[PDB]
């Protein structure tokens, strides 16, 4: 039932948001029922896939509804539910505390209500500061009416790993700008690193005092971004479409930006449709892995990928246990990572299989769209505007399962029956 | 017929192997992991479970079995609690292996359909063979009449059936004579009695003992 | 070292076979050093990928070398090694018996020498019978000189899951022929079901007496072929290129043939280059799964896929153990299946990544070629003749690791150090 | 300096926590899983291992530690075998916690650089405080001279240092006086002695006892 | 020759290490996980298995070994049930380590080809060295004749072989003399006998004892 409340509550925000975006006040042009549902779903799942342009289709009131859905979806449904109860004065019960444990993917209910207070106060604080830093650049270019709103929209979009942009070019006019690049990359890296990771750094200022999860996220993100930055820079250096007609300083900014944006923000500075096939293959893995178990990102998490990778290497080296940072990893941690990765690949495989039947598109664009939708990244190669009515409905299901997680989606409709009986061992050759 | 055998001991494991040999669906339940692994190939289904738990008992589908045999005869608490659960679950036939006289009385109170004493019944049959070496195997038709498979002595060699006045004097009827792996069913007068082989007889319990001593 | 003998011995057969195919006697046309190495590697790994046509490039002596490499590679290197020692009269030692255990993926050395006697005698018996059955059809069409050799070549090719064909069209002229379809499909289904599975059926004639592995292979293959036959027939029914201009009887034969050929024979009756993208996606998952742990097939095995799939479903249902056919599955079986599947996907990902850098080809053909090469299937969409010199070298590495298995390849160069020390448990969130 | 502490007991775990507090690299080795999990946060590296095994000892990189402390004082077999391995591995400093007199003699034979009796040394120091309640803590400079931190009595209240003839009669030197958490280092004549607080004195062992009884 | 050693104790592990040193294929079987890990490097193949189980015994390919050594000498039930299985599997040579006299009698009944008493045979040989310190090592050719490697005394210093009338009076033959690590094979008369070194002699069991007492 705690997984059932998450599934029902997260689905109701799509329906409420779809009605608000479909009103004539919130839009400048007539909008289809599927496009309103797709835009609402792409906001609460915080993916960023846009059939229609956000700046032109929606009004200022319509974009305010987008910011509400991004903020609600980015921080989670139960994060704001506790705040409403706390403001009204009602005390948080044991039943209400178990919902927070399931929503934040926590193993224990020890100090989980206080974590929500920290992460909500940190979210509004860092989005307000980043809007002020972006205000020094967006105001002389777009005045005071639009410059302040563009900074506020993008600070919320970047921190929550959304990738929504008001401009027709999604950050393609700020390739060489250090102000936009440094501030926005600081937002989704810190916003996607994990709320538990941020809380550990705030209370502990020394690296040796960090937990195993915090040390995995800090070292894992640094190593993964370094490999991605080298891969994009080497592969796309001679590409004429992207990273070719740019200065050496501008090549370093665009390579750094495209290394960190697939996990899982989905902003861009170069066109992904004109990149080589080698870089797209490496991004598929890149955006299949997210960042942080309790964060604004999705996909399989960075810690899930490291746990599985280390467990295999330990088996290949003959070791009897998985050891990272001189800490053993128990069997329940391994089997949970196994269930996340296998279920995620099965859903992605069904998404690619269903899209090839429906959509008439190149195969590389279909695979890129499904990995982007499931990981809630939002990067496109030119397929989302070309999707049919049946194709958009498949992506909405993919984005919904991707944000809520494959495990919590299955636990909604999979009743658990407890049986203490056991069975004799059977030998099966799995070579 | 679907059978469930709970407790895979020397007695319970023999029922599983014999019923599986005859071609019956047998569920083998034991709390020991090693016992279940050994009898996994000798049962249709083998489960590691505790029978004193109602939740584990309902996970086996135990309500689908007409016969349940509780072959636990050293743990009275496990034996009596199991058959209390099965009686509550309305099992038509519950056969329980008992330990002593007091365990027999508890199982009779809580509704055990048949109570079995395997070692006590064999010890009585073995002690009959120790007391009189002429007998080999006997079956008690009643408290006064029995069928005894005797062993031929040296004085009965080269003797005809008509020579033995079992029908007239002893009041006993010779049923079958087995000679070197060949069994003669209902022999007719007269047949020569060979050396020390089987000789099935039927009569009163006291009358057969007179035949052994005199002849 | 037992994995090292397998890797060295299997690699030496490629070098010996490459020299024999490069001689002027064995070929009618000049052959490149890479094409001779590719053809030799595609035979001992029993894949069937052909840059040049087998019938035209090679002579009768050259095709005899192909049959030798298929037979040696199909049954394994150590299978014939024991036979040579037994013929010479030398007794099989404990050291020689441990090599057979590693080659056949057996858990114990109990009765493993006698298994080699059964599987070798069964192989020559069933290939001789199937050649006689194929002789009643191939002789009136190709005379006695070529008809007898075509039947002998194809019986060995089909049983060992090779897919090599002398004709320019790989079995595309026998779509509606029940004689070719039934006999050849009977060969690689029985030849790929597993040598341990065949030995169990021979000695036990009742299904309830079968082991867990035998019951998994018999039921798993029947269910997997039924789903594949329905998927190919439904998706390709309206396709004009394949399965469109055929009778209802011929549609059932071609759908049945294409359902069973990706695991892992690689024969065909329809052109895979003209199929829809939906069928190709299902075929990649199909040929990523092989058949039988000790057989002539490759890829991850059918039992590996079932063990992982059942382990996840048990976790999603809240069950504490993996139970198939009322038998518990221990932790060492699960972790070995986990290591096979993760290592295989990592090698396939590196193969697709390396081919996109080198080859200028459509992405669907690159993914199809890598899954076909790693699973040693040999199905093509039109890429193998178009591979460059660097592209062919990548496929040779992929075919080599795929046949020997990812685990045995890694164990060759991964030294095992035993440490009895343990570490304190660390908590890492893998949601 | 790299330290390895083998055996995380009351004595071994205190060395791990104190050395980790001072900022030292400590390897905590114990055969108990629960002990290692408790001291994982109080040590640089904590390993579950058996120290009597040479293969497990070499897996720790134990040759890289200058100081190894074997804090096993209830298992003589585990304690003596461990230090035999470490002596064979040429560890420069091996400090072993002993159990009794016979355990001390074995470790001296097999080359233990320093042998420690934690409970025996504390019991002697505690028994000195029980015998004379005027003392609080003492340190034995030699077998005849010691520094004793005395406790002020009621008769020493409102008394100057020059009034106390410790230098002339008793032959003892007053070292430091602590008043209500404030410590006076090397007081000069004369200072008023307050109520029952610390009073550090130095002199002969027999001479301090005369000062306690007379004053 | 392929050897299987079941039970890796002090006696069984010594056979594994010695046969592996000579270059033989040894299968080391033990029920203890730690024993198998220790002897994994000292055996061609080391398996953790229970030898009393026929299914586990057939998984080892135990029918391919000409010699199987059952080195279990403290568990009679494990020792006798193992060799009953191996005898049923038609192993040509089964060598069993016994515990006492009654264990020796059981293994002789169930068909053990050779029965070994390692501690009993060494204790008899050691007690011969305790009783007479002049002997160092002896080998019993029969019940009355033996080859004894004596130790030279102080009275035998600077004595020639011809001076010692062992051949004539004692009826014993001097076989070999070892001097400071140098061994003289079959010395010829006459050689000077040095200080307390080895002196191999051969003769009757009672005759050698006379030589020790007189000379
Ligand atoms: N609660 C239980 N549920 C299921 N099996 C049980 C339970 N308690 C005991 N058993 C099993 O029942 C079997 C027989 O019980 P037990 O050995 O106590 O009786 P027994 O009279 O000595 O047996 P037998 O004479 O048949 O050898 C054993 O294998 C034991 O593990
Ligand atoms: N072989 C061993 N290797 C490593 N640690 C060991 C070994 N044997 C015992 N220990 C651990 O050493 C620690 C201290 O040993 P033990 O408790 O026997 O001694 P002690 O003198 O009673 O301890 P203390 O007085 O410090 O509490 C325990 O935590 C014990 O688990
Ligand atoms: N059933 C069994 N199968 C295999 N190994 C066994 C079995 N039972 C015992 N062992 C092993 O046999 C070895 C030797 O047996 P055990 O220690 O009982 O005999 P022992 O006479 O004391 O030995 P030793 O004098 O050689 O040290 C031990 O390592 C023990 O674990
Ligand atoms: K996003
Ligand atoms: K093939
Ligand atoms: Na009994
Ligand atoms: Na103590």
Curated annotation (Swiss-Prot), chains A, C:
Sequence intervals crossing the membrane: 5-25, 32-52, 65-85, 113-133, 147-167, 182-202, 216-236, 272-292, 299-319, 337-357, 363-383, 394-414
One Pfam entry name: TrkH
GO molecular function: potassium ion transmembrane transporter activity; potassium:chloride symporter activity
Location (main, coarse): membrane
Cellular localisation: Cell membrane
Phenotypic consequence of gene deletion: Impaired potassium uptake.
Protein keywords: Cell membrane, Ion transport, Membrane, Potassium, Potassium transport, Transmembrane, Transmembrane helix, Transport
GO CC list: plasma membrane
Membrane-topology annotation of the record: Multi-pass membrane protein
One BP term from GO: potassium ion transmembrane transport
Keyword Cell membrane (UniProt): yes
Subunit record text: Homodimer. Part of the KtrAB complex formed by an octameric catalytic ring of KtrA and a membrane associated dimer of KtrB forming a potassium channel.
Family recorded in the similarity comment: Belongs to the TrkH potassium transport family. Ktr (TC 2.A.38.4) subfamily.
NCBIfam families to which the protein is assigned, alphabetical: 2a38
Known role: Integral membrane subunit of the KtrAB potassium uptake transporter. The 2 major potassium transporter complexes KtrAB and KtrCD confer resistance to both suddenly imposed and prolonged osmotic stress.
PANTHER family named among the record's database cross-references: KTR SYSTEM POTASSIUM UPTAKE PROTEIN B, TRK SYSTEM POTASSIUM UPTAKE PROTEIN TRKG-RELATED
Name listed for the protein in its UniProt record: Ktr system potassium uptake protein B
The species this protein was found in: Bacillus subtilis (strain 168)
Lineage, opening ranks: Bacteria, Bacillati, Bacillota, Bacilli, Bacillales
Gene that this sequence comes from: ktrB
Swiss-Prot record, chains B, D, E:
Location of this chain's protein in the cell: Cell membrane
Effect of disrupting the coding gene: Impaired potassium uptake.
GO molecular function annotation: identical protein binding; monoatomic cation transmembrane transporter activity
Any one of the GO BP annotations: potassium ion transport
UniProt GO cellular component terms: plasma membrane
This protein's UniProt keywords: Cell membrane, Ion transport, Membrane, NAD, Potassium, Potassium transport, Transport
InterPro entries xref list: NAD(P)-bd_dom_sf, RCK_C, RCK_C_sf, RCK_N, Trk_Ktr_HKT_K-transport
UniProt domain RCK N-terminal: residue ranges: 1-116
Membrane association type: Peripheral membrane protein
Residues bound to NAD(+): 10, 30-32, 50-51, 72-74, 97-99, 103, 119
Domain RCK C-terminal: 133-215
Function summary: Catalytic subunit of the KtrAB potassium uptake transporter. The 2 major potassium transporter complexes KtrAB and KtrCD confer resistance to both suddenly imposed and prolonged osmotic stress.
PANTHER family: KTR SYSTEM POTASSIUM UPTAKE PROTEIN C (PTHR43833:SF7), POTASSIUM CHANNEL PROTEIN 2-RELATED-RELATED (PTHR43833)
Subunit structure, as described in the record: Homodimer, tetramer (dimer of homodimer) and octamer (tetramer of homodimer). Part of the KtrAB complex formed by an octameric catalytic ring of KtrA and a membrane associated dimer of KtrB forming a potassium channel.
Family to which this protein belongs: Belongs to the KtrA potassium transport family.
Protein name: Ktr system potassium uptake protein A
Species of the source: Bacillus subtilis (strain 168)
